[PDB]
Symmetry: C2
Subunit: 147 residues, 2 copies
Amino acid sequence: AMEIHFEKVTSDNRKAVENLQVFAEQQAFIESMAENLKESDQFPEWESAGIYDGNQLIGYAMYGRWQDGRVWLDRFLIDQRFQGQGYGKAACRLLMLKLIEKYQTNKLYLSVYDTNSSAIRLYQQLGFVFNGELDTNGERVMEWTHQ
Amino acid sequence: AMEIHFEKVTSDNRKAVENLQVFAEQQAFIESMAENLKESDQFPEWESAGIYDGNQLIGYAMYGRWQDGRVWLDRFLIDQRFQGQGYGKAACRLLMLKLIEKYQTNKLYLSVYDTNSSAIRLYQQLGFVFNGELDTNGERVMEWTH
Ligand SMILES: [Cl-]
Ligand SMILES: [Cl-]
Ligand SMILES: [Cl-]
Ligand SMILES: [Cl-]
Ligand SMILES: [Cl-]
Ligand SMILES: [Cl-]
Ligand SMILES: [Cl-]
Ligand SMILES: [Cl-]
Ligand SMILES: [Cl-]
Ligand SMILES: [Cl-]
Ligand SMILES: [Cl-]
Ligand SMILES: [K+]
Ligand code: NA
Ligand code: NA
Ligand code: NA
């Protein structure tokens, strides 16, 4: 019957884990977000934010200065009820400007999966370019430079 | 009118953020999971594992013993393809036994959202009980004492 075992995440299975299908587990993603928030609250390097249009919460973002001094956009979500209507790009641009005002640097960093075309296009339109680096999770790094 | 602004997450809006309707966004999940793995790999307290049935990846776990001294079950997911087949109970039970061996403790902790009926049931069936504590995110803590 069942042969349940656990494996450390490595390059051999990381992408399989990243592609775990979970597109109905509404209660599960509640738990995912609660942990997301807990993990951000744990370390002062990280900060979570709700994204609002007026009084309506439309999304979420996590970001922060990592130890190397690089500033990262770690998570960025728009609620499904509000997608396809220019919120992501508008919110992402504003977040970018807030980050480079908060911190000294004029560079921001993120990493993307090699198939997330909907997101890559958004970040590309906002000035993010692939910089030839790989993140620790094997994702391709993108970098926004201000000038 | 479009009026975009950003608010710190506090008790005023945390549960609103926790309930963001992002459960139908496939590509968003890949990034969410990738970020989970990045954060897990960063801190030695935390460990991520794939859950397998033989050669089939069926789920994901994240767990850690933090500076406080308690061992937590931080993240636990079963792929929606293999839901409702008993993999939740069996894998969680096996994971519990792994952690009390790996660490010195005979206790394990998790926290759950109140409206999560399946989770509270599942965890209770395995021996977890509400211990009257609140987590940092406002979730009710459950505890399993071996
Ligand atoms: Cl195992
Ligand atoms: Cl695999
Ligand atoms: Cl849009
Ligand atoms: Cl590019
Ligand atoms: Cl490149
Ligand atoms: Cl703002
Ligand atoms: Cl608060
Ligand atoms: Cl998608
Ligand atoms: Cl979870
Ligand atoms: Cl299950
Ligand atoms: Cl109980
Ligand atoms: K999770
Ligand atoms: Na990333
Ligand atoms: Na780790
Ligand atoms: Na929790």
